């Protein structure tokens, strides 16, 4: 599934996801990256922590520049249990966690993706 100790280069998955949505109807925050607006509310960009929605935590891994070296992939995984954390928590489901199950379920099979991808000499 992967490998405990360098990563290849986890990227190519990060933008299956994204690319499987696609309806910014807030085009602002709520579905885009703050950090991505003027150099002003760059700061605010942490409080409202770095990303809760979906594309913008998974472009945004990406996006980073791919920082790599993980141990299992916790680092994408720590951010989408932290998005749907979030979610039902502050106002997303409260009753039908189901609906935040199904975006929880593609991004693991992106994983898979990758993680052939980077079979000869990086995650095996």
């Given at each position: 599934m992967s490998q405990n100790r360098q990563l290849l280069y986890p990227r190519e998955e990060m933008v299956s996801l994204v690319r499987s949505l696609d309806r910014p109807?807030?085009?602002?925050?709520?579905?885009?990256?703050?950090?991505?607006?003027?150099?002003?509310?760059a700061e605010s960009y942490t409080k409202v922590c770095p990303n809760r929605c979906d594309l913008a935590t998974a472009a945004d891994r990406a996006a980073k520049g791919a920082y790599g070296y993980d141990v299992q992939l916790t680092t994408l995984k720590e951010d989408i249990r932290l998005m749907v954390n979030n979610c039902?928590?502050?106002?997303?489901?409260?009753?039908?966690y189901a609906d935040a199950a199904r975006t929880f379920e593609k991004f693991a099979m992106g994983k898979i993706d990758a993680y052939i991808s980077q079979k000869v000499g990086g995650l095996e």
């Open positions: 109807q807030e085009n602002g925050l709520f579905s885009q990256d703050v950090l991505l607006q003027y150099p002003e509310l039902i928590l502050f106002n997303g489901a409260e009753g039908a």
